[PDB]
Amino acid sequence: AQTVPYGIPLIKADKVQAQGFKGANVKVAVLDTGIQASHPDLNVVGGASFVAGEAYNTDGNGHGTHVAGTVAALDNTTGVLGVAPSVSLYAVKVLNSSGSGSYSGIVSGIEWATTNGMDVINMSLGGASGSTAMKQAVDNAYARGVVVVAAAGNSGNSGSTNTIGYPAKYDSVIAVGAVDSNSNRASFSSVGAELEVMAPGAGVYSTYPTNTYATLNGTXMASPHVAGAAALILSKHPNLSASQVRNRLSSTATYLGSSFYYGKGLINVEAAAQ
């Protein structure tokens, strides 16, 4: 009765979960459209909302719930399986039900996450431009020991044009691209010098608002695979610093082609958590 989305074994999260490392006691903040906390396949420990009128534990869009499920859908006999099923899941609502949010709201969610001691922050969101406030927020979270992961964007490639969005473009954040079940680069996946790693992003099945499950495409789906992987590494090696977890993900990646299109390649968590 429990479906294992193709992305779990593609990044070898299953090999690691098999060793008994499932992200227990690692704190992951999902800065998104909120999370349908009542979903049977998700356990949200807490959060905050920086969007007017909406509580953090509701998701009127679907996006946040889907991202959360890829990171931590509960290991049981129903629904799907998350990359790090035992993680302490926090919903930080920074995007409205239309999937949009302000820099101010985003910066506050990052700050809240750093202040509240999150170990990993996932941002399946981005903008064409950045802001010093946002750069300062991510550089500080990173310097504080937090692993910061962001979706690279879905602008595809325009010749030699860099299409990586913010915050993924900042060097203190891991810019994640998207591949499909054949491990091929998804056409929509953004390109550019800052692209760091790749993760499953096309045809990703996960938890979806009102106790169901749905399939979505996007670097938004790729990102939570890396956030979850970071969680597995930390549960296995509590001692590592954020930069060490980051380097482990990128050094052990499966080469797929030119770094402008694939970064260091597809993540392999079995090899990264060795």
PDB file of N, CA and C in Angstrom, residues 44-84:
ATOM      1  N   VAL A  44       4.051  17.308  10.939  1.00  0.00           N
ATOM      2  CA  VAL A  44       4.657  18.633  11.047  1.00  0.00           C
ATOM      3  C   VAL A  44       4.822  18.970  12.523  1.00  0.00           C
ATOM      4  N   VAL A  45       6.059  19.188  12.944  1.00  0.00           N
ATOM      5  CA  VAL A  45       6.331  19.507  14.336  1.00  0.00           C
ATOM      6  C   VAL A  45       6.102  20.982  14.697  1.00  0.00           C
ATOM      7  N   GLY A  46       6.181  21.865  13.716  1.00  0.00           N
ATOM      8  CA  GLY A  46       5.973  23.261  14.023  1.00  0.00           C
ATOM      9  C   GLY A  46       6.196  24.123  12.814  1.00  0.00           C
ATOM     10  N   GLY A  47       6.231  25.433  13.033  1.00  0.00           N
ATOM     11  CA  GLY A  47       6.431  26.361  11.950  1.00  0.00           C
ATOM     12  C   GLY A  47       5.973  27.755  12.302  1.00  0.00           C
ATOM     13  N   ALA A  48       5.942  28.600  11.283  1.00  0.00           N
ATOM     14  CA  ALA A  48       5.529  29.981  11.428  1.00  0.00           C
ATOM     15  C   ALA A  48       5.014  30.436  10.074  1.00  0.00           C
ATOM     16  N   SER A  49       4.188  31.472  10.065  1.00  0.00           N
ATOM     17  CA  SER A  49       3.663  32.001   8.814  1.00  0.00           C
ATOM     18  C   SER A  49       3.974  33.482   8.715  1.00  0.00           C
ATOM     19  N   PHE A  50       4.587  33.870   7.608  1.00  0.00           N
ATOM     20  CA  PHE A  50       4.926  35.267   7.356  1.00  0.00           C
ATOM     21  C   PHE A  50       4.088  35.812   6.196  1.00  0.00           C
ATOM     22  N   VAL A  51       2.949  35.154   5.957  1.00  0.00           N
ATOM     23  CA  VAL A  51       1.995  35.526   4.921  1.00  0.00           C
ATOM     24  C   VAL A  51       0.740  35.950   5.673  1.00  0.00           C
ATOM     25  N   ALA A  52       0.198  37.110   5.319  1.00  0.00           N
ATOM     26  CA  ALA A  52      -1.005  37.639   5.962  1.00  0.00           C
ATOM     27  C   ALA A  52      -2.264  36.776   5.784  1.00  0.00           C
ATOM     28  N   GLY A  53      -2.971  36.496   6.877  1.00  0.00           N
ATOM     29  CA  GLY A  53      -4.211  35.739   6.793  1.00  0.00           C
ATOM     30  C   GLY A  53      -4.198  34.215   6.751  1.00  0.00           C
ATOM     31  N   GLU A  54      -3.026  33.603   6.575  1.00  0.00           N
ATOM     32  CA  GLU A  54      -2.917  32.140   6.514  1.00  0.00           C
ATOM     33  C   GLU A  54      -2.023  31.558   7.615  1.00  0.00           C
ATOM     34  N   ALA A  55      -2.505  30.527   8.293  1.00  0.00           N
ATOM     35  CA  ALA A  55      -1.729  29.878   9.344  1.00  0.00           C
ATOM     36  C   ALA A  55      -0.672  29.028   8.629  1.00  0.00           C
ATOM     37  N   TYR A  56       0.380  28.630   9.341  1.00  0.00           N
ATOM     38  CA  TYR A  56       1.457  27.842   8.735  1.00  0.00           C
ATOM     39  C   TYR A  56       1.051  26.401   8.396  1.00  0.00           C
ATOM     40  N   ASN A  57       0.122  25.860   9.172  1.00  0.00           N
ATOM     41  CA  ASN A  57      -0.334  24.489   8.994  1.00  0.00           C
ATOM     42  C   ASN A  57      -1.470  24.256   8.004  1.00  0.00           C
ATOM     43  N   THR A  58      -1.654  25.181   7.082  1.00  0.00           N
ATOM     44  CA  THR A  58      -2.653  25.034   6.046  1.00  0.00           C
ATOM     45  C   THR A  58      -1.867  25.322   4.769  1.00  0.00           C
ATOM     46  N   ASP A  59      -2.296  24.728   3.669  1.00  0.00           N
ATOM     47  CA  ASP A  59      -1.660  24.907   2.365  1.00  0.00           C
ATOM     48  C   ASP A  59      -2.800  24.989   1.349  1.00  0.00           C
ATOM     49  N   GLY A  60      -3.096  26.215   0.925  1.00  0.00           N
ATOM     50  CA  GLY A  60      -4.163  26.417  -0.025  1.00  0.00           C
ATOM     51  C   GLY A  60      -3.701  26.265  -1.454  1.00  0.00           C
ATOM     52  N   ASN A  61      -2.423  25.958  -1.647  1.00  0.00           N
ATOM     53  CA  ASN A  61      -1.895  25.810  -2.990  1.00  0.00           C
ATOM     54  C   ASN A  61      -1.603  24.365  -3.361  1.00  0.00           C
ATOM     55  N   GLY A  62      -0.866  23.671  -2.509  1.00  0.00           N
ATOM     56  CA  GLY A  62      -0.518  22.287  -2.780  1.00  0.00           C
ATOM     57  C   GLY A  62       0.980  22.081  -2.854  1.00  0.00           C
ATOM     58  N   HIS A  63       1.663  23.092  -3.372  1.00  0.00           N
ATOM     59  CA  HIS A  63       3.107  23.111  -3.564  1.00  0.00           C
ATOM     60  C   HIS A  63       3.937  22.736  -2.318  1.00  0.00           C
ATOM     61  N   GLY A  64       3.666  23.402  -1.193  1.00  0.00           N
ATOM     62  CA  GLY A  64       4.394  23.126   0.044  1.00  0.00           C
ATOM     63  C   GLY A  64       4.218  21.711   0.555  1.00  0.00           C
ATOM     64  N   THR A  65       2.993  21.202   0.493  1.00  0.00           N
ATOM     65  CA  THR A  65       2.702  19.849   0.933  1.00  0.00           C
ATOM     66  C   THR A  65       3.495  18.839   0.073  1.00  0.00           C
ATOM     67  N   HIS A  66       3.495  19.062  -1.237  1.00  0.00           N
ATOM     68  CA  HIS A  66       4.204  18.205  -2.170  1.00  0.00           C
ATOM     69  C   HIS A  66       5.722  18.203  -1.860  1.00  0.00           C
ATOM     70  N   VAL A  67       6.309  19.379  -1.676  1.00  0.00           N
ATOM     71  CA  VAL A  67       7.733  19.484  -1.347  1.00  0.00           C
ATOM     72  C   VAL A  67       8.018  18.763  -0.011  1.00  0.00           C
ATOM     73  N   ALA A  68       7.175  19.006   0.997  1.00  0.00           N
ATOM     74  CA  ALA A  68       7.362  18.397   2.305  1.00  0.00           C
ATOM     75  C   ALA A  68       7.351  16.888   2.224  1.00  0.00           C
ATOM     76  N   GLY A  69       6.432  16.351   1.427  1.00  0.00           N
ATOM     77  CA  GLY A  69       6.306  14.920   1.264  1.00  0.00           C
ATOM     78  C   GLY A  69       7.533  14.272   0.665  1.00  0.00           C
ATOM     79  N   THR A  70       8.200  14.956  -0.254  1.00  0.00           N
ATOM     80  CA  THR A  70       9.415  14.415  -0.863  1.00  0.00           C
ATOM     81  C   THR A  70      10.529  14.340   0.201  1.00  0.00           C
ATOM     82  N   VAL A  71      10.557  15.310   1.104  1.00  0.00           N
ATOM     83  CA  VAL A  71      11.550  15.291   2.165  1.00  0.00           C
ATOM     84  C   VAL A  71      11.213  14.281   3.249  1.00  0.00           C
ATOM     85  N   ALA A  72       9.981  14.332   3.746  1.00  0.00           N
ATOM     86  CA  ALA A  72       9.611  13.498   4.879  1.00  0.00           C
ATOM     87  C   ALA A  72       8.322  12.712   4.943  1.00  0.00           C
ATOM     88  N   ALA A  73       7.755  12.298   3.819  1.00  0.00           N
ATOM     89  CA  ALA A  73       6.554  11.473   3.923  1.00  0.00           C
ATOM     90  C   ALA A  73       6.904  10.277   4.840  1.00  0.00           C
ATOM     91  N   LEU A  74       6.025  10.024   5.803  1.00  0.00           N
ATOM     92  CA  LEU A  74       6.187   8.964   6.795  1.00  0.00           C
ATOM     93  C   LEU A  74       6.364   7.559   6.239  1.00  0.00           C
ATOM     94  N   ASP A  75       7.281   6.810   6.839  1.00  0.00           N
ATOM     95  CA  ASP A  75       7.536   5.450   6.408  1.00  0.00           C
ATOM     96  C   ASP A  75       6.487   4.594   7.111  1.00  0.00           C
ATOM     97  N   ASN A  76       5.482   4.171   6.357  1.00  0.00           N
ATOM     98  CA  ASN A  76       4.406   3.360   6.900  1.00  0.00           C
ATOM     99  C   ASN A  76       3.825   2.503   5.779  1.00  0.00           C
ATOM    100  N   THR A  77       2.552   2.157   5.853  1.00  0.00           N
ATOM    101  CA  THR A  77       1.994   1.338   4.797  1.00  0.00           C
ATOM    102  C   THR A  77       0.928   2.097   4.015  1.00  0.00           C
ATOM    103  N   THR A  78       1.192   3.370   3.757  1.00  0.00           N
ATOM    104  CA  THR A  78       0.249   4.154   3.010  1.00  0.00           C
ATOM    105  C   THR A  78       0.974   5.308   2.342  1.00  0.00           C
ATOM    106  N   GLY A  79       0.342   5.890   1.329  1.00  0.00           N
ATOM    107  CA  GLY A  79       0.923   7.034   0.656  1.00  0.00           C
ATOM    108  C   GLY A  79       2.255   6.806  -0.022  1.00  0.00           C
ATOM    109  N   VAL A  80       3.191   7.732   0.183  1.00  0.00           N
ATOM    110  CA  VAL A  80       4.525   7.650  -0.415  1.00  0.00           C
ATOM    111  C   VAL A  80       5.606   7.499   0.666  1.00  0.00           C
ATOM    112  N   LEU A  81       6.862   7.570   0.262  1.00  0.00           N
ATOM    113  CA  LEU A  81       7.973   7.458   1.197  1.00  0.00           C
ATOM    114  C   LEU A  81       8.870   8.651   0.951  1.00  0.00           C
ATOM    115  N   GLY A  82       9.218   9.349   2.031  1.00  0.00           N
ATOM    116  CA  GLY A  82      10.088  10.503   1.936  1.00  0.00           C
ATOM    117  C   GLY A  82      11.545  10.072   1.939  1.00  0.00           C
ATOM    118  N   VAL A  83      12.428  10.990   1.572  1.00  0.00           N
ATOM    119  CA  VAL A  83      13.862  10.710   1.531  1.00  0.00           C
ATOM    120  C   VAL A  83      14.417  10.468   2.944  1.00  0.00           C
ATOM    121  N   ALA A  84      13.909  11.240   3.907  1.00  0.00           N
ATOM    122  CA  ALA A  84      14.321  11.187   5.315  1.00  0.00           C
ATOM    123  C   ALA A  84      13.034  11.201   6.173  1.00  0.00           C
TER     124      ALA A  84
END
